[PDB]
A paper describes a structure:
We established a process to generate bispecific designed ankyrin repeat proteins (DARPins) that simultaneously target HLA-I/peptide complexes and CD3e. DARPins, which are based on an ankyrin repeat scaffold, create an elongated solenoid fold that creates a rigid, concave interface for target binding. In this study, we developed and characterized bispecific T cell engagers by combining two highly specific DARPin molecules to target the tumor-associated HLA-A∗0201/NY-ESO1157-165 complex and CD3ε. We demonstrated that DARPins can serve as a novel scaffold for TCEs that combine high specificity, potent T cell activation, and minimal off-target activity.
The structures of NY_1 alone and in complex with HLA-A∗0201/NY-ESO1157-165(9V) were highly similar, with an overall root-mean-square deviation of 0.4 Å. Each of the five post-processed maps permitted unambiguous placement of the crystal structures of NY_1 and HLA-A∗0201/NY-ESO1157-165(9V)23. In contrast to antibodies and TCRs, DARPins do not contain cysteine residues. As a result, they can both be readily expressed in soluble form in Escherichia coli at very high yields and exhibit favorable biophysical properties.
Residue numbers in the entry: 13 to 169
Amino acid sequence: DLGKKLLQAARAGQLDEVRELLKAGADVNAKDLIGVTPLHLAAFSGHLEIVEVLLKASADVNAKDVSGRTPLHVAAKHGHLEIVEVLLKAGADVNAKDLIGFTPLHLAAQFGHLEIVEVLLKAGADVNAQDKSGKTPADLAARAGHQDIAEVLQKAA
């Protein structure tokens, strides 16, 4: 199972092994049971070089796991600014919504990643996007105590 070994290499941050498995024929979009792909796992663990290798191998940058999250959601939630930037350059959907209505901007605002908030805004993120409870990214920032981010977002409204 090359797909499973690729999921493990991507999660573990094994750059050489990811390249060899891709050359051997591993499905770049292999999925585990919750539907996460090697791109999701590399974004999760902050492995920038693996993300770039996966993108060059035509990984689907907007693949959604069963929660509806894309790799951009993952990278934005976990603070990985360089990965957010490379995903955006590859065509990641800055306004993709998961099953609770969160965009990547919701997650960057909720988890207090101001630099990522600024990058997403430069990429056209919708500041007025509402989740399924009606809440905007600025609402989430305020709720989590990140007043500087809420001010930036309310300024951009």
